[PDB]
Design a protein around this ligand. Structure first.
Ligand SMILES: Cc1ncc(COP(=O)(O)O)c(CN[C@@H](CCC(=O)O)C(=O)O)c1O
Ligand SMILES: Cc1ncc(COP(=O)(O)O)c(CN[C@@H](CCC(=O)O)C(=O)O)c1O
Lengths: 397, 397
């Protein structure tokens, strides 16, 4: 017989398919005894388990025939309505998705072809890179700094290339924590409007602001200006339950129709029980829930910064968050994050090495830390161990 | 300002993105008053809504932290073990997917490139066609007949073409209802083994057999032979709940790894609550449940044939199912199924015109009828109305 060799049987796509270190690391971090600063896993004590149990049961008893049946792709109507009210659009402009990860998959399918340019920050969210990579695009990057993307570098890229879209996370970027301030958002919008460019705005961390208010999204600025080119991505993952896999894409009807049709082939539709459950949980008390979310992450972030300031040598650089889940660390004198990873893990501490957040490589001396999962005690202890680990490595470079 | 034009903004991919008529028809059929022979939607009386409610609440109360949190991509351990035991493999060989529709999308990503040959029947499941078409493949088809795929036709294709895989639904195919007999399964396996080819075997309707026993799957026959090239797809959709979106792929470790990594970029993971709920519902009493689902559909099938034999002119031909959800109809004298659909719709009867089930086109005179949803009375009355529409159109052309 002719042998079957898998490497041979695979299409060219398969070579662009690689594991996510974030996804893989969860197998390690969910194990008892690990102090995790790895994945952006929401604080478990914010899970409304009792309320979820009541809501799920009522949905299934009274609306079982709907929760358990096939449903149209666009989403459970009341959820589309609720998202529409919150974001300030019409329901028919909302698509419910299977996590914002799916929306990333969908936008890559709709806009990217082999060799097509796509613009994102270096570093940016590895899951977006992973999703877009499948299409075989050319990644164009600009540095991400404490004030979001380098707009001068962006202006230079735009003189040379026409990206299929710009993928951005203006509000507490994954992984740097950067917040793009209002003037830069307006400058960005101007650059995109002048060139009629598409922006995919990933707003996973929208509500996790630590300060008095949130900044207007690029989507809200675009809507004010009457510009139709911002595709807006939001998620219930960081505010309620990541495991429910319920999120949304809001877009111009032409773009949304393509995202809908791509979704039909991706999974038919997002599980109906899950969408119903989100809507039942959020339809009353959402602002109050969001206030608590903000406080819980603000306190964790404060504990995180207090411990880093005390335990980490001053030669090591790290960002200070104004929101979201992450601190971004840069190691000096050529230290490897993978080296540090090894040491820390021996001390039961996990983080994410920064390398794979760089779509074109580099960043071997960087790492992302999440303060979302651990309580204050665990944050302090975990950072003490990391600090110990760094000093040992710094001693021996 | 350079104008933004969506048709211009889209990649080549977007041109390959089209609506599924199955998915679109749900918008119509789920409205009150319609007698739907359209999508393969299970009978609502089979939804264990009361039991699902108890199970959901207990999962959320007792294991809420797990149900609501991010989880690794492969799936909930006890569900994978459940599947492993049922199918007869190791849990490490099982990937939990967000419905088998997701598995189809993943298989296209791993195996297909622009211009890559892929083999399926004409007609076949339109969702598979939709998922695969994204990659820009060259579709090769063989007729789907009463014994399943035309193997003489396949034998001819294989002398000239090397498909990336053969997509098959041997057990009550969508849309013809055909059952590939054991000798034919054995022949196909020899054909595949000699050439070292991959088969994607879609077993959505596996358990829905009307006769005394089910036939061995291509997967089972390959496993007996020690052949590693069958990727096996199964789902809880046709036996428990389509709305939960919980299914599985089983494959050789190398193929499975690629499916896992592709799924990471597609949605991270299938929601944990849904996986847990499926396992809790089926861990006891699965055999008995399946006995009842076979009964329900067998009855519906009998009603459907009884009504068609009564109401439909003998110049119209249709399949007689031995399992599954569908009857496949072929109109004479080049009568259009789309014309029939318009007439039938005016009388509140819906079905799926057969055209989109043909990956390279044709089949305009065909249609798929599902007896899954309606009860005996609805089936009889719906077919009465279809017969009247059919008889009307038969007179004009
Ligand atoms: C900016 C951004 N967008 C999208 C996603 C996907 O989230 P959805 O739940 O699908 O809406 C993440 C995931 N953030 C986590 C993922 C953790 C995991 O995959 O285990 C992270 O980056 O650690 C993200 O940071
Ligand atoms: C052979 C086959 N495979 C896979 C699927 C995907 O189902 P999953 O629930 O994701 O496992 C279907 C859907 N059959 C129905 C779908 C109806 C709808 O999309 O509303 C049908 O073909 O009517 C199918 O017929």
């Amino acid at each position: 017989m002719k042998p079957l060799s898998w490497s041979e049987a695979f299409g060219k796509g398969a070579g662009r398919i690689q594991a996510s270190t974030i996804r893989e690391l969860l197998k390690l971090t969910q194990r008892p005894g690990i102090l995790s600063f790895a994945g952006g896993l929401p604080a478990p004590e914010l899970f409304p388990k009792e309320e979820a149990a009541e809501a799920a049961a009522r949905i299934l008893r009274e609306k079982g025939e709907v929760a358990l049946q096939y449903s149209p792709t666009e989403g459970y109507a009341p959820l589309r309505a609720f998202v529409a009210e919150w974001i300030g659009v019409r329901p028919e402009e909302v698509l419910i998705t299977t996590g914002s990860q799916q929306a990333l998959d969908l936008v890559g399918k709709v806009f990217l072809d082999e060799g097509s340019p796509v613009l994102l920050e270096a570093p940016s969210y590895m899951g977006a890179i992973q999703a877009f990579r499948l299409q075989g695009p050319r990644f164009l990057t600009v540095p991400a700094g404490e004030e979001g993307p380098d707009l001068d570098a962006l202006e230079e890229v735009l003189k040379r290339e026409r990206p299929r879209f710009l993928y951005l996370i203006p509000s507490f970027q994954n992984p740097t924590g950067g917040l793009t301030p209002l003037p830069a958002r307006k400058r960005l919008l101007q650059m995109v409007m002048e060139r009629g460019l598409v922006v995919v705005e990933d707003d996973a961390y929208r509500e996790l602001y630590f300060g008095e208010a949130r900044l207007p999204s690029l989507f809200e600025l675009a809507r004010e200006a009457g510009y139709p080119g911002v595709i807006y991505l939001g998620s219930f993952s960081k505010v309620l339950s990541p495991g429910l896999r319920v999120a949304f894409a809001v877009a111009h009807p032409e773009a949304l129709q393509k995202l809908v049709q791509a979704k039909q082939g991706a999974d038919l539709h997002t599980p109906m029980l899950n969408q119903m459950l989100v809507h039942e949980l959020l339809k009353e008390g959402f602002s109050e829930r969001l206030e608590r979310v903000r406080r819980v992450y603000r306190e964790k972030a404060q504990a995180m910064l207090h411990a880093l300031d005390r335990e980490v040598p001053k030669e090591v650089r790290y960002t200070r968050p104004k929101g979201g889940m992450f601190v971004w660390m840069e190691l000096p004198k050529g230290l490897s994050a993978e080296g540090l990873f090894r040491r820390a893990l021996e001390e039961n501490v996990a983080f994410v090495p920064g390398g794979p957040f760089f779509a074109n490589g580099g960043g071997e001396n960087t790492l992302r830390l999440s303060y979302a999962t651990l309580d204050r005690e665990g944050i302090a202890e975990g950072v003490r161990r990391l600090g110990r680990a760094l000093k040992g490595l710094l001693a021996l470079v």
